[PDB]
Symmetry: T
Subunit: 53 residues, 12 copies
């Protein structure tokens, strides 16, 4: 596909994808275990802005 | 355009697009008359995950 | 219980519950690992229609 | 099924399902063409109460 | 004011404002005790339509 | 009614109300077939801002 | 009706309906005043899961 | 226009519209720089009450 | 408790907590009967900013 | 980048990006200062439809 | 930190943290596997109350 | 106050607060110009989990 999951987000380098920084959620990915790429950021920012929610 | 509607969703095979399994909504598409493609699924999963809402 | 979880949803036969079709989310269940039954669809459609979000 | 759509909602008596009272939407069903039954009201009230959203 | 509360909603005729039909919520107002006026309905429909 | 639906929104001139630009939704009204008036925009902006 | 309010929830034993624990809200029902039954939990879990919102 | 923006909200007295109270947001307007009029408060209450969300 | 309810909100000075200014909602607390403290404003602004809704 | 921001939206021709038609929000972009392209419209319509918001 | 996850929630005493009471979700934690502390209940109630959503 | 804005979020080191990486939004702060501290991440994760909407 033109836009795959790996084109949108990548494994968070702080927690290595666990989403944790025990005993708290990893602050770099907020527990998701992934961070956004530029393309993922661009799409997410557009959506949030026009739907707000 | 790079991503058209037909790249995101296609006619549901169970209701042939009516979104209905009278007198109830079609269980496969939840009343939408369409089902997602792999590309549509990938994009929707990404958005819901990061916006949560 | 008049309506149990298995009256509302059932394991997705394609990913067998993992919600995955590596490296993407499973297109059938949108990564949830389950598909709706007719009863689950009737209730969810009603709720969404009258609440919306 | 245990709970069918007709157990949850019925045709709005003020517009007969058109959802309209020209040139405005029908005030009794808010344009949906349907009103709730006692069962529908009971379930929806419970869901909105515990999710609000 | 131009549009006051009573211009938007009015006491539910079924429960008289209790929002109840013991031991269940009133089916006509969904437990709110009030129903929409034509003006209230017009405004609410517009908002939901464009905000969802 | 102080504010009617026609005071809030009007027919989208691009799709002439269809909401479509087959095989895609009309980019101007997002498939609604209507666009906002000044009054509708004033109210919607207010609500969105304070509720989100 | 097949599913009545009392089938979904019952009065809270920590606050007995009040929902308060002056000066704070009751933690057991989060100021709701009631606690879900198994059937209420099952339905609410299902709805939240599929609507997220 | 029967209802203009100034009929719904007015510049906040405390922050004079900046929406700030360094280094924090202004507590009277919640950082918005405006406060509601009676009419705005009336409409917003009605909307939140019927849409909640 | 490091942060109690009275640390986040206080009774409204205009309606004395009733949340009413018959026949309308109190324009200062939007019918809540309370107003935010600085701490409450800072927390609410942060949450709404990163979730939005 | 397969889809850039300029591929999704463009400066509003009425307010030239200010989002204002003083003293009111611009009616063409609802104060956002931008309007959707066909591609942005296609994507937003899809998202709202399958999430609703 | 001032307010740690442990200060906000604790392991559900009923399901011992799995969030399950097979084949259903645990009715005490609603499938979350944790319950709220007094501090957690206070913050959550404040946020729900003022975001209404 | 016990928890100040800077206890919750800090300037994004990628865009230094602009929230931009022209001609796109900054991928590290998603255009907000700030990133979360450990405490902010802990609070947000909590609210989202127990409200997620
Ligand atoms: Mg919902
Ligand atoms: Mg809303
Ligand atoms: Mg929220
Ligand atoms: Mg959304
Ligand atoms: Zn991480
Ligand atoms: Zn179908
Ligand atoms: Zn699957
Ligand atoms: Zn009707
Ligand atoms: Zn009633
Ligand atoms: Zn159009
Ligand atoms: Zn209680
Ligand atoms: Zn202010
Ligand atoms: Zn007040
Ligand atoms: Zn404009
Ligand atoms: Zn449990
Ligand atoms: Zn940045």
């Amino acid at each position: 596909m033109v836009i795959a999951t790996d084109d949108l987000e990548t494994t968070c380098p702080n927690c290595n994808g666990s989403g944790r920084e025990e005993p708290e959620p990893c602050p770099k990915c907020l527990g998701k275990g992934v961070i956004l790429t530029a393309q993922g950021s661009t799409l997410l920012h557009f959506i949030k802005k026009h739907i707000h929610e």
